Amino acid sequence: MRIKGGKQTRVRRKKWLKQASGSFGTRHASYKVAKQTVIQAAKYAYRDRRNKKRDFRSLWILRLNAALREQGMTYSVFINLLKKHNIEINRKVLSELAIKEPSKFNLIVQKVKS
Amino acid sequence: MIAFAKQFRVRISPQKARLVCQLIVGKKTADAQNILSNTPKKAATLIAKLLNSAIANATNNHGMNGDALYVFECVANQGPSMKRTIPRAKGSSNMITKRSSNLVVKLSDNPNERQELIKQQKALVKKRVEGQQKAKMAR
Amino acid sequence: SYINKPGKTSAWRVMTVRQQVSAVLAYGKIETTLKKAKNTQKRLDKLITLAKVDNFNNRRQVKKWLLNTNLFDVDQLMDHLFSKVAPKYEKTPGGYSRVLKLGPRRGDATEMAILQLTD
Amino acid sequence: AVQQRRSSKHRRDKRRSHDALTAQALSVCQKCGKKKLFHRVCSCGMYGDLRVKKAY
RNA sequence: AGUUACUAAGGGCUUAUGGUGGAUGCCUUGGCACUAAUAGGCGAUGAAGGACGUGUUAACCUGCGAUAAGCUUC
RNA sequence: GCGAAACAGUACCGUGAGGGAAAGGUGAAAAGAACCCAGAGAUGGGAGUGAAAUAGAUUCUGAAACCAUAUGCCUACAACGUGUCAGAGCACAUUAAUGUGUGAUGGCGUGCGUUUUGAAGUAUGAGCCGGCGAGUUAUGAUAGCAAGCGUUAGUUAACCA
RNA sequence: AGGGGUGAAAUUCCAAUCGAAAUCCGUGAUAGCUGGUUCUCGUCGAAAUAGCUUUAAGGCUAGCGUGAGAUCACAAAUAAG
RNA sequence: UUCUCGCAGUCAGACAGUGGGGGAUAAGCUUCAUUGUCAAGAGGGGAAGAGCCCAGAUCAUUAAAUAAGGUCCCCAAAAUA
RNA sequence: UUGUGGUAGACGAGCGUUGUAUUGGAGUUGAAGUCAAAGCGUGAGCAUUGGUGGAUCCAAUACAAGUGAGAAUGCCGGCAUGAGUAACGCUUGGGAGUGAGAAUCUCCCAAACCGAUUGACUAAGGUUUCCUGGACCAGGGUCGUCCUUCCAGGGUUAGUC
Ligand SMILES: [Mg+2]
Ligand SMILES: [Mg+2]
Ligand SMILES: [Mg+2]
Ligand SMILES: [Mg+2]
Ligand SMILES: [Mg+2]
Ligand SMILES: [Mg+2]
Ligand SMILES: [Mg+2]
Ligand SMILES: [Zn+2]
């Protein structure tokens, strides 16, 4: 018994090529390059799915530092004024968003002054 | 309302025919026949005859207006090739490949004629989604 | 590279000039390349101007240039010149010929030009 | 001297940008009607109002 | 003094088409390997293999041999 | 699959022994596309036959690499293993989904197999696409698992029908 | 006419090839030596040392991995004395 | 990690700390004993580094506290004396 | 509750393909194959709709294997890039004619090389290349109305060579 099987190979390569669309040049045409680029893209996806929560926290810190620097104290002093006194688990983003709807944030920053 | 005309396996290159086909495309027919006759190219004596034949096909067969015509869309697709051997120093026998071109010229009558192809494109997906939806009634 | 054609040696240029002036006097029109026509015109004009006096010195000086053609032989072409072509132009200061450009050739896309001469 | 890396379909198309042709100047001979390329004699054999050739 | 839509010689991405090109799929007067019977040779009465020729018909293939794409007889 | 589905041991290479290929499919049936227009003509476009002429003699289907055309978006101060995570504006509208295509701009980012102590590698393999292509078989040995049969057990080989 | 020939000798020439022609066959020669060896998910997870080796780019046994089974307290680990 | 049975792989190692040989208290040198790491292992620090320091990735989260290292801007984070 | 990085390497469970067997069943009211789409799965992989296409095929359980391709300076076919780049392999000017079309063909006139030869006769070879008429798929390093190419017809005549 002889088995040729050109169906399965083409279907597999078609899936790999379909994965990489919107790629420059031949990367979406030739399969040999498409597989390399899909592998590399998924590596980058795995690394960035961690780097982005590494970075968004930093952005929230930055936009909280800026808001507090216009009241007379720094972010590195505000965190004490949440943990030790008036123990609060308000998150590190929402205290950021509260500036985009301000004058409810000022209530926070003057509440810890007690 | 297109009335094309095609010549197959002309002994010209595809890449030399595309140079004058660019000259002729999008322009009106009165300033295409003459502008193509007057240019000094091998790819022009081979397209003047074809363009005039397309003119005659449009005018006789389909029955369009004539002085409303314009060259809708021009190409020189790759026709079949010929493979030949060429001697060399010390007998190494490179392969010369003679080219060819399947010229085709389309002559539209109404100035737009392009949104209609898009309309057919959109219908061909509208009916796909519609057949998809009518088969969601599997309950 | 090595073995190469003799090419457009100066003798080739001058002999082409002689043949073309013979041909233009014989018939009265030439259909040649433009950039040989502009070069033939000078010698044409010089001959016709040198040929209005008809002494034997002018016959000798023109014998140095002409060649026989199918229409006229050289000693017939000399008489044909000095009898009807040269005296016709005797009052025109310069401007004995014109070179007008034809259409490009199919073989080479060279700029064909016609050389002729009329009053 | 050879290429070390194949010049893709992108670099090649960019090079041919300057290859486009020019539409040669066209005039309309008086004494008959037709589009002779300018500064030539049309197939009439007439250049302007002067005759330089045969019928065609 | 300053802000910013438009350009695209040409390129890039997607989507649709057209051309070359002939893989995948269906098929086959073909091959492969075997079984059961039969038979296990042809040849100076000139073989095997070949040339050459023959037509109402060009060439080629086939059949055939100056009785020559056929003759006799049951 | 015989080297060979067809005029194959042909064409072809070689002085010679000898070496030695590739390619098939219209349609049910030629009803093989009279006639007209353009053209020198092949041919093409209508007509006509036919279920279909995107079946037209390039003849079953007709992917990919590859070459051209086009709607939509971006690009002419910009350092780029060419993608990813964010993200504007723009244009559309689906295997109805916290949707689709492009993606000005920020952060981040030295390919794949191989062999090597260690390669982005100034080490090597691959131009690209498709197809073909590499731990099987006979007869015995031991081990694991399962089954039949069993305490004077178990078990057939050749051969014959 | 080839484990031959020819050579005013050079390892010359022997059908564009000659430190011993060309093609066929044994023949799928052998190669501790390069290169290649094609589908997925889960569990566990090393060595690059010792002895010997006409051995040192390889091989055998021990050492180290894994699977199946037993030992289950006196065996093996980890701290103090 | 002891014993028996099946199945292999491996025998070209590298660097940093420590104690010495050869070396010239020279080598990213060579040869050993030892502790790690890499190999066969990603993340953060180190500007960039296979082998150093911290650590040991099932996958998603635009959640919180930390280790080494670090807080003028690039680059997230600090002030007083 | 303890865990879940991992090459060589041991072990386990699995997807897919081709065919056979029985069991169900779909198909010209359009089967497989092929492209396209904004689906579903932990993965190998699997559906749905539409265009094309024009006759076989899908699922369940076992069974048997030419059973699964990105690499072998792999084999075969196609196609790019380099590139419309180098090359085009010793020589002219014109008149008249033909023809749809001429540098390139026919005639004429010169012109330029050969001349112990590019001349004339034959042997060896080659095997119709010779002559006339016609054609311009391919070959001609361009073109071509023309060729030593192709097609139809033709030609080789010995007592003494
Ligand atoms: Mg290199
Ligand atoms: Mg250019
Ligand atoms: Mg692999
Ligand atoms: Mg190299
Ligand atoms: Mg160049
Ligand atoms: Mg150059
Ligand atoms: Mg050149
Ligand atoms: Zn005119």
φ, ψ at B92 (rounded to 5°): -115, -15
Q: Domains in chain A: how many in total?
A: 1
Rounded-to-integer distance, Cα A45 and Cα A17, Å: 18
What element of type H or E holds B108?
strand B101-108
β-bridge pairing D35-37 and D26-28: antiparallel
φ, ψ at B107 (rounded to 5°): -125, 110
φ, ψ at D35 (rounded to 5°): -105, 90
Strand F proximal residues, A:18-57, Cβ < 7 Å: 21-27, 29-33, 36-37, 39-41, 44-45, 47-49, 51-52, 55
**Closest ligand to residue C1's CA:** 7
Owning domain of residue A48: 1-114
Q: Resolution, in Å, please?
A: 3.4
- Written in H, E and C, the secondary structure of C49-107 is HHCCCCCHHHHHHHHCCCCCCCCCCHHHHHHHHHHHHHHHCCCCCCCCCEEEEEEECCC
The one-character DSSP state at C105 is: P
Measured between beta carbons, the chain C residues lying within 8 angstroms of D49 are: none
Q: Radius of gyration over alpha carbons of chain C, in Å?
A: 16
Q: CB of A7 under 7 A from strand F?
A: no
Strand I proximal residues, B:18-77, Cβ < 7 Å: none
Report how this structure was experimentally obtained: cryo-EM
Q: Radius of gyration over alpha carbons of chain B, in Å?
A: 21
What element of type H or E holds C58?
helix C56-63
The domain ranges of chain B are 4-135
- The answer to whether A30 contacts chain D (CB < 8 Å) is no
Measured between beta carbons, the chain C residues lying within 8 angstroms of D39 are: 101
Q: Which amino acid is at B30?
A: A
Distance A62 CA to H73 C1' (A): 14
Q: For the domain bounded by B4-135, which CATH number is listed?
A: 3.90.470.10
β-bridge pairing C111-116 and C29-33: antiparallel
Rounded-to-integer distance, Cα B103 and Cα B10, Å: 8
Q: State how far residue A24 is from chain D, nearest Cα, in angstroms.
A: 10
b/e burial code for range A40-70 (CB count within 10 A of at least 16 → b): eeeeeeeeeeeeeeeeeeeebbeebeebbee
CA-to-CA dists, residue B79 to A80, B7, B49, B61, C21, angstroms: 79, 10, 19, 27, 50
Inter-chain CB proximity D24 and B20 less than 8 Å:
no
